[PDB]
Design a protein around this ligand. Sequence first.
Ligand SMILES: [Mg+2]
Ligand SMILES: [Mg+2]
Ligand SMILES: [Mg+2]
Ligand SMILES: [Mg+2]
Ligand SMILES: [Mg+2]
Ligand SMILES: [Mg+2]
Ligand SMILES: [Mg+2]
Ligand SMILES: [Mg+2]
Ligand SMILES: [Mg+2]
Ligand SMILES: [Mg+2]
Ligand SMILES: [Mg+2]
Ligand SMILES: [Mg+2]
Ligand SMILES: [Mg+2]
Ligand SMILES: [Mg+2]
Ligand SMILES: [Mg+2]
Ligand SMILES: [Mg+2]
Ligand SMILES: [Mg+2]
Ligand SMILES: [Mg+2]
Ligand SMILES: [Mg+2]
Ligand SMILES: [Mg+2]
Ligand SMILES: [Mg+2]
Ligand SMILES: [Mg+2]
Ligand SMILES: [Mg+2]
Ligand SMILES: [Mg+2]
Ligand SMILES: [Mg+2]
Ligand SMILES: [Mg+2]
Ligand SMILES: [Mg+2]
Ligand SMILES: [Mg+2]
Ligand SMILES: [Mg+2]
Ligand SMILES: [Mg+2]
Ligand SMILES: [Mg+2]
Ligand SMILES: [Mg+2]
Ligand SMILES: [Mg+2]
Ligand SMILES: [Mg+2]
Ligand SMILES: [Mg+2]
Ligand SMILES: [Mg+2]
Ligand SMILES: [Mg+2]
Ligand SMILES: [Mg+2]
Ligand SMILES: [Mg+2]
Ligand SMILES: [Mg+2]
Ligand SMILES: [Mg+2]
Ligand SMILES: [Mg+2]
Ligand SMILES: [Mg+2]
Ligand SMILES: [Mg+2]
Ligand SMILES: [Mg+2]
Ligand SMILES: [Mg+2]
Ligand SMILES: [Mg+2]
Ligand SMILES: [Mg+2]
Ligand SMILES: [Mg+2]
Ligand SMILES: [Mg+2]
Ligand SMILES: [Mg+2]
Ligand SMILES: [Mg+2]
Ligand SMILES: [Mg+2]
Ligand SMILES: [Mg+2]
Ligand SMILES: [Mg+2]
Ligand SMILES: [Mg+2]
Ligand SMILES: [Mg+2]
Ligand SMILES: [Mg+2]
Ligand SMILES: [Mg+2]
Ligand SMILES: [Mg+2]
Ligand SMILES: [Mg+2]
Ligand SMILES: [Mg+2]
Ligand SMILES: [Mg+2]
Ligand SMILES: [Mg+2]
Ligand SMILES: [Mg+2]
Ligand SMILES: [Mg+2]
Ligand SMILES: [Mg+2]
Ligand SMILES: [Mg+2]
Ligand SMILES: [Mg+2]
Ligand SMILES: [Mg+2]
Ligand SMILES: [Mg+2]
Ligand SMILES: [Mg+2]
Ligand SMILES: [Mg+2]
Ligand SMILES: [Mg+2]
Ligand SMILES: [Mg+2]
Ligand SMILES: [Mg+2]
Ligand SMILES: [Mg+2]
Ligand SMILES: [Mg+2]
Ligand SMILES: [Mg+2]
Ligand SMILES: [Mg+2]
Ligand SMILES: [Mg+2]
Ligand SMILES: [Mg+2]
Ligand SMILES: [Mg+2]
Ligand SMILES: [Mg+2]
Ligand SMILES: [Mg+2]
Ligand SMILES: [Mg+2]
Ligand SMILES: [Mg+2]
Ligand SMILES: [Mg+2]
Ligand SMILES: [Mg+2]
Ligand SMILES: [Mg+2]
Ligand SMILES: [Mg+2]
Ligand SMILES: [Mg+2]
Ligand SMILES: [Mg+2]
Ligand SMILES: [Mg+2]
Ligand SMILES: [Mg+2]
Ligand SMILES: [Mg+2]
Ligand SMILES: [Mg+2]
Ligand SMILES: [Mg+2]
Ligand SMILES: [Mg+2]
Ligand SMILES: [Mg+2]
Ligand SMILES: [Mg+2]
Ligand SMILES: [Mg+2]
Ligand SMILES: [Mg+2]
Ligand SMILES: [Mg+2]
Ligand SMILES: [Mg+2]
Ligand SMILES: [Mg+2]
Ligand SMILES: [Mg+2]
Ligand SMILES: [Mg+2]
Ligand SMILES: [Mg+2]
Ligand SMILES: [Mg+2]
Lengths: 46, 272
Amino acid sequence: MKRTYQPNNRKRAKTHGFRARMKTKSGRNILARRRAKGRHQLTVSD
Amino acid sequence: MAVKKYRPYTPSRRQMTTADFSGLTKKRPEKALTEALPKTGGRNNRGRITSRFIGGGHKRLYRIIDFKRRDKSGVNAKVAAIEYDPNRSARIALLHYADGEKRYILAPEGLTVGATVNAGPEAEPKLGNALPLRFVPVGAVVHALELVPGKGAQLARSAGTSVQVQGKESDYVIVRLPSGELRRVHSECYATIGAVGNAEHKNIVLGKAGRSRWLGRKPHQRGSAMNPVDHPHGGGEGRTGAGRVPVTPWGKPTKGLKTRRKRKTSDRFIVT
RNA sequence: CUUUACUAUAGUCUGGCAUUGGGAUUCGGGUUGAAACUUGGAUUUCUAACCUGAAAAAUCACUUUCGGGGACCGUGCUUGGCGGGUA
RNA sequence: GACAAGGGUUCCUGGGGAAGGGUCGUCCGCCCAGGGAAAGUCGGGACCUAAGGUGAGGCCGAACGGCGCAGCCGAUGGACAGCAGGUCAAGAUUCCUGCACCGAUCAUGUGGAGUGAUGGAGGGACGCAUUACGCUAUCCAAUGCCAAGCUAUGGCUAUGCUGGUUGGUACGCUCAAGGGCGAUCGGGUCAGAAAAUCUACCGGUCAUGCCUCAGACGUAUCGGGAGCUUCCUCGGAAGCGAAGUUGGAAACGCGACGGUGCCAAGAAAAGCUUCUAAACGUUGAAACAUGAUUGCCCGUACCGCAAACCGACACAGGUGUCCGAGUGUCAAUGCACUAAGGCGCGCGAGAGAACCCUCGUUAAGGAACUUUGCAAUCUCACCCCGUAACUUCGGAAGAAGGGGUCCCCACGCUUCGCGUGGGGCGCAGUGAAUAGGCCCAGGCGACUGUUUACCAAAAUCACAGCACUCUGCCAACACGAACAGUGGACGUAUAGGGUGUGACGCCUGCCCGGUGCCGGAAGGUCAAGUGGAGCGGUGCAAGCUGCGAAAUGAAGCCCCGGUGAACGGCGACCGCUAAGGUAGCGAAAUUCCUUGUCGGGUAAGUUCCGACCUGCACGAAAGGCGUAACGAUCUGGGCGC
RNA sequence: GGACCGAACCGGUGCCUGCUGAAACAGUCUCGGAUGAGUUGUGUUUAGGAGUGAAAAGCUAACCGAACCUGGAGAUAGCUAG
Ligand SMILES: [Mg+2]
Ligand SMILES: [Mg+2]
Ligand SMILES: [Mg+2]
Ligand SMILES: [Mg+2]
Ligand SMILES: [Mg+2]
Ligand SMILES: [Mg+2]
Ligand SMILES: [Mg+2]
Ligand SMILES: [Mg+2]
Ligand SMILES: [Mg+2]
Ligand SMILES: [Mg+2]
Ligand SMILES: [Mg+2]
Ligand SMILES: [Mg+2]
Ligand SMILES: [Mg+2]
Ligand SMILES: [Mg+2]
Ligand SMILES: [Mg+2]
Ligand SMILES: [Mg+2]
Ligand SMILES: [Mg+2]
Ligand SMILES: [Mg+2]
Ligand SMILES: [Mg+2]
Ligand SMILES: [Mg+2]
Ligand SMILES: [Mg+2]
Ligand SMILES: [Mg+2]
Ligand SMILES: [Mg+2]
Ligand SMILES: [Mg+2]
Ligand SMILES: [Mg+2]
Ligand SMILES: [Mg+2]
Ligand SMILES: [Mg+2]
Ligand SMILES: [Mg+2]
Ligand SMILES: [Mg+2]
Ligand SMILES: [Mg+2]
Ligand SMILES: [Mg+2]
Ligand SMILES: [Mg+2]
Ligand SMILES: [Mg+2]
Ligand SMILES: [Mg+2]
Ligand SMILES: [Mg+2]
Ligand SMILES: [Mg+2]
Ligand SMILES: [Mg+2]
Ligand SMILES: [Mg+2]
Ligand SMILES: [Mg+2]
Ligand SMILES: [Mg+2]
Ligand SMILES: [Mg+2]
Ligand SMILES: [Mg+2]
Ligand SMILES: [Mg+2]
Ligand SMILES: [Mg+2]
Ligand SMILES: [Mg+2]
Ligand SMILES: [Mg+2]
Ligand SMILES: [Mg+2]
Ligand SMILES: [Mg+2]
Ligand SMILES: [Mg+2]
Ligand SMILES: [Mg+2]
Ligand SMILES: [Mg+2]
Ligand SMILES: [Mg+2]
Ligand SMILES: [Mg+2]
Ligand SMILES: [Mg+2]
Ligand SMILES: [Mg+2]
Ligand SMILES: [Mg+2]
Ligand SMILES: [Mg+2]
Ligand SMILES: [Mg+2]
Ligand SMILES: [Mg+2]
Ligand SMILES: [Mg+2]
Ligand SMILES: [Mg+2]
Ligand SMILES: [Mg+2]
Ligand SMILES: [Mg+2]
Ligand SMILES: [Mg+2]
Ligand SMILES: [Mg+2]
Ligand SMILES: [Mg+2]
Ligand SMILES: [Mg+2]
Ligand SMILES: [Mg+2]
Ligand SMILES: [Mg+2]
Ligand SMILES: [Mg+2]
Ligand SMILES: [Mg+2]
Ligand SMILES: [Mg+2]
Ligand SMILES: [Mg+2]
Ligand SMILES: [Mg+2]
Ligand SMILES: [Mg+2]
Ligand SMILES: [Mg+2]
Ligand SMILES: [Mg+2]
Ligand SMILES: [Mg+2]
Ligand SMILES: [Mg+2]
Ligand SMILES: [Mg+2]
Ligand SMILES: [Mg+2]
Ligand SMILES: [Mg+2]
Ligand SMILES: [Mg+2]
Ligand SMILES: [Mg+2]
Ligand SMILES: [Mg+2]
Ligand SMILES: [Mg+2]
Ligand SMILES: [Mg+2]
Ligand SMILES: [Mg+2]
Ligand SMILES: [Mg+2]
Ligand SMILES: [Mg+2]
Ligand SMILES: [Mg+2]
Ligand SMILES: [Mg+2]
Ligand SMILES: [Mg+2]
Ligand SMILES: [Mg+2]
Ligand SMILES: [Mg+2]
Ligand SMILES: [Mg+2]
Ligand SMILES: [Mg+2]
Ligand SMILES: [Mg+2]
Ligand SMILES: [Mg+2]
Ligand SMILES: [Mg+2]
Ligand SMILES: [Mg+2]
Ligand SMILES: [Mg+2]
Ligand SMILES: [Mg+2]
Ligand SMILES: [Mg+2]
Ligand SMILES: [Mg+2]
Ligand SMILES: [Mg+2]
Ligand SMILES: [Mg+2]
Ligand SMILES: [Mg+2]
Ligand SMILES: [Mg+2]
Ligand SMILES: [Mg+2]
């Protein structure tokens, strides 16, 4: 019963990446949106 | 004039027909002439499907061909081999140039291995001699014609197709395309004597489904199978013919689709 | 979701105006029976705009040497039609 | 059993007993602490490129941004130097022991001359199926060798039983299948931007010939080796060490880039080999071996078909590759039992009621059950004999149907056995396990295939074949802020797009009035726009201004012609509307009345088959009517059980 | 050889069991394909009136005739409750 989550690191990191979110404005938004309220530890740390 | 039909040893293979060979020299496409990077891929481009279907099929290698053949004018060449080229539907000739360079040209009908061929304007109208239209005899049958001086041969390179030379009017020579259309081409345009090979490609019986698949995939969906959302003809209770017949994004069958253009006054009798 | 329901619309066809120039012929006519400053139309033609292809320099750029197309096309503005493709 | 993912101390040692564990728990993959992971040679980087991602310049867009040549990035591929053993509680092609190789640097001798680029060329370099020969891994046999022992309950006293039976390296005139190589002079400038002593092309000149070892063998040597020994701190430590035979089988692995056949015609790039340009040296070069020196970065424990990864669980689910023994059975990764190895699935004990699940046997009967033989039997392997209508001559077909099968002896042969004869046993001999029930008719689709992840697998969709139609190449056509770009296509009407039909065979009629579509000089209407007669406002006027029509003005509809494998139409009592059904079929997947009427089959048949025809509402590419074969398709019937 | 029988594998025909499941789609038995239009690993590309689709309105992260999240936003609610 194959499930949705098939972990594959570096796919995980290829999308979703700090490096990745930096390349576009939309994620860069999300990045600095998360630096904000939500003192969050985010992205490639997890 | 061989075909190779089969027995009916399977459910298929009765109707199935393959092509004929042994006119083809066993040799490989050889060294970089090919330099083949077809990298076959469906209609995708910027990521979406443009020309529908065509989703698979056997790995190929493109063999570069010399279409214009201007530069080798006044230089002898002797036919070496005739090789099988996929994505062509014509045989191609190898030869060798006197200066020693090897190229490819498509193979006209009836070109034997070892024939002496000479490109250029002064050349005799022997098979495959690559000369300008001004120097082409009236009514003689040629192929691989340039649409414009320079560039390459955009006219009649598919198997069995030829263009006979109608009487020249101006520096433009009248010709007749294999669709039956008449045109006007510059007499500065090269062409190759004779008609294309591969016998009649047309009547090979193409086996069953999947022989299709040896080539571009194309399962070809029939939008009246589809739901209304997907396609106009779609929708119905049981089988229903049309109600309209525009397709697939509106349009229709018949209804000439060509824009009104500047090439149109170089054109003679667009009717068929 | 559908169509000959309403309405607009992507799209597309078409007239006018730019980009956009020259010369022959002809008819329409004005300003000083022809001369002739000419103003436009129609066909025709040329070539500097413009498009485009080959050449040791793959997309480009160039003196380019060139070859073809060429006042068309394409494109901006506007005119009217078509337009369940879409809303 | 070993890996790749993924997980992250789960590994090892010593503790612990709250919670986690489906009960317990002194125990654990849980808790605490401590330790463990070693690389020039393995995998990745300091090398290469594919798809794709980038992308100075360049091309485009209300912005943010979208493209795009070179180059760069990118292993799932190319390239590349080591094996054999030993061993911590816990690592090993990493550490140590023995022997080996690779690069870089320098010194010494040979050599004492050339070296060889960001550029050229060679080559790297590639498919599917089938297959000959040699071999190994590897397994099998024995009265082959070695080692240890003992005599069991009747017997055996070994000719019984048990285990073991060689790996690396070096050399060797030894054996050896298999495997790929022409060599050289000269010429032409128009080839590879010039170059070239290189490659290509053209011309001349001379079975065998060479090169190669897979693997076998012999000698040597370093390992390993059944066990033997003593110590033992509870059970492990150190030391010792025998022989390695003949006969057989054998790969998807090696000898290889082998041989042949086939059509759908099977990456790129660097390293690498050769060649010059530029440059340096033309006395200290290239090359060779000879020591020395040097060898970076990351990964490496443990789980890894699973209580350690994805499933909320110590979850009957799922997860890619490699290895995967023996005996029996044509063969096999099948089936049964077993080796090495791993395990008995983290509640337990009793009871032997109803009912419930999963099974075994069943009297006489044998489908009577029921919507339906649903389910479950019967059937089953291999050998021999034999086998229909129908057929597209392939098929149907494993059609149905019948016989054989075990053990001993003798004989013959191509001896893993088979054939023949004779004999023996049991109720029974593919003696247990894995292996079809079959047939007669129809309906639909020809066919293999595809489809509703989680109620539908089909008669749906695809399909080869056929037809209409568009498209002359900045093609039609599709994506798109965009005269950018790309796809169609590095394709050029034997091509590409769209549409419907759907092997094959015999075929495909009548009606264009309306709608669409192609072609249509008269004529009717028609937008902006040119033109601007005239009507009015204000001012005393020059004048400034508000509307404003004849003519002229494009595509389009109106009007004319054609076109049905174009939308369509061929009984709302014939009713008039362009015509009203050519074949073929018809109670049909179409039929209302209906269980139509006859006939067949049954004891009895609303079904099924055959007729008929009165077709409520068959019919020719929404194709008509047939059709061998095919079907986890649907319908009716028979035998067998 | 879109041939046959049949493992691996790919798939889901029929019955049953399961239905607070062992399991948010499975288990036994049975059956289909098993050199092709075959199966599948790795990297990559395409998405919300958008993609994909041998075509069910199927799939697009366990509920797709228009995914999810955040926002407009205390949408509106001639209706139901309180
Ligand atoms: Mg942190
Ligand atoms: Mg990190
Ligand atoms: Mg998290
Ligand atoms: Mg024949
Ligand atoms: Mg689409
Ligand atoms: Mg064809
Ligand atoms: Mg088709
Ligand atoms: Mg449908
Ligand atoms: Mg629609
Ligand atoms: Mg429809
Ligand atoms: Mg219908
Ligand atoms: Mg379209
Ligand atoms: Mg518009
Ligand atoms: Mg308008
Ligand atoms: Mg609407
Ligand atoms: Mg409308
Ligand atoms: Mg295992
Ligand atoms: Mg890991
Ligand atoms: Mg680790
Ligand atoms: Mg432990
Ligand atoms: Mg322990
Ligand atoms: Mg406890
Ligand atoms: Mg505690
Ligand atoms: Mg407990
Ligand atoms: Mg423990
Ligand atoms: Mg070492
Ligand atoms: Mg690179
Ligand atoms: Mg590239
Ligand atoms: Mg880009
Ligand atoms: Mg690119
Ligand atoms: Mg790799
Ligand atoms: Mg190596
Ligand atoms: Mg490496
Ligand atoms: Mg130990
Ligand atoms: Mg270990
Ligand atoms: Mg080791
Ligand atoms: Mg010297
Ligand atoms: Mg040299
Ligand atoms: Mg062999
Ligand atoms: Mg014995
Ligand atoms: Mg023995
Ligand atoms: Mg020996
Ligand atoms: Mg294998
Ligand atoms: Mg071979
Ligand atoms: Mg490179
Ligand atoms: Mg020099
Ligand atoms: Mg390990
Ligand atoms: Mg559990
Ligand atoms: Mg458990
Ligand atoms: Mg489990
Ligand atoms: Mg699996
Ligand atoms: Mg094996
Ligand atoms: Mg076995
Ligand atoms: Mg066996
Ligand atoms: Mg088994
Ligand atoms: Mg285990
Ligand atoms: Mg127990
Ligand atoms: Mg039972
Ligand atoms: Mg009985
Ligand atoms: Mg009976
Ligand atoms: Mg009854
Ligand atoms: Mg009954
Ligand atoms: Mg049954
Ligand atoms: Mg059975
Ligand atoms: Mg026969
Ligand atoms: Mg039958
Ligand atoms: Mg007896
Ligand atoms: Mg008997
Ligand atoms: Mg048996
Ligand atoms: Mg049994
Ligand atoms: Mg009949
Ligand atoms: Mg019937
Ligand atoms: Mg079917
Ligand atoms: Mg079959
Ligand atoms: Mg389903
Ligand atoms: Mg189903
Ligand atoms: Mg363009
Ligand atoms: Mg293009
Ligand atoms: Mg159909
Ligand atoms: Mg008429
Ligand atoms: Mg009846
Ligand atoms: Mg009835
Ligand atoms: Mg009767
Ligand atoms: Mg009956
Ligand atoms: Mg009757
Ligand atoms: Mg009944
Ligand atoms: Mg019934
Ligand atoms: Mg009947
Ligand atoms: Mg007809
Ligand atoms: Mg029809
Ligand atoms: Mg019909
Ligand atoms: Mg039909
Ligand atoms: Mg019929
Ligand atoms: Mg099937
Ligand atoms: Mg049924
Ligand atoms: Mg029946
Ligand atoms: Mg009887
Ligand atoms: Mg097959
Ligand atoms: Mg058969
Ligand atoms: Mg499926
Ligand atoms: Mg399964
Ligand atoms: Mg079967
Ligand atoms: Mg839409
Ligand atoms: Mg989820
Ligand atoms: Mg879903
Ligand atoms: Mg919704
Ligand atoms: Mg509210
Ligand atoms: Mg609001
Ligand atoms: Mg409202
Ligand atoms: Mg409100």
